[PDB]
Amino acid sequence: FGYIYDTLEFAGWSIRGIDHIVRNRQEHSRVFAGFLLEGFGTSATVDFQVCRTAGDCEDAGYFTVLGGE
Amino acid sequence: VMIRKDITQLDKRQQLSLVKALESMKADHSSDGFQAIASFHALPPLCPSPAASKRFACCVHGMATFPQWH
Numbered sequence: 001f002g003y004i005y006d007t008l009e010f011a012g013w014s015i016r017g018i019d020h021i022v023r024n025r026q027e028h029s030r031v032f033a034g035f036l037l038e039g040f041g042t043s044a045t046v047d048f049q050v051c052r053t054a055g056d057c058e059d060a061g062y063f064t065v066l067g068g069e
Numbered sequence: 070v071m072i073r074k075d076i077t078q079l080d081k082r083q084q085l086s087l088v089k090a091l092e093s094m095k096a097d098h099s100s101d102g103f104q105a106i107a108s109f110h111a112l113p114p115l116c117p118s119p120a121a122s123k124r125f126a127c128c129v130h131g132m133a134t135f136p137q138w139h
């Protein structure tokens with residue numbers, strides 16, 4: 001589809017820069033939560049928090065899904 | 070390929086470097102230093118010689134050479 005973008009970059013990082021940076025990101029330990037998205041009804045947003053056994057809980061983060069009937 | 074970009078486009082990190090660099094440049098005691106560099110364009114006038122009685126400002130202004138000098 002003859003169309004192009006003026007620039008292909010993400011937040012000032014060169015494509016080469018991006019690849020190099022990503023490897024570095026791996027360098028440190030990271031923990032993730034995995035969500036299996038089953039499919040929602042109407043669009044909804046989800047918020048999740050991690051709670052300690054003690055009962056403290058911190059807002060983990062959020063993501064949303066677009067949908068309709 | 071050092072790249073010159075619009076000042077607005079610049080990243081915080083990019084900005085970070087410039088701010089620090091210039092600040093350090095300001096400090097630079099060397100002839101390469103900022104204060105010394107500034108003298109190139111105008112006063113103190115360096116043109117005839119760094120030490121000459123009459124000194125003129127380094128402006129190849131009003132001349133074809135002008136863009137090259139700048």
Ligand code: CUO
Binds near residue numbers: 110128130139
């Ligand atoms: O300064 Cu001599 O030119 Cu803009």
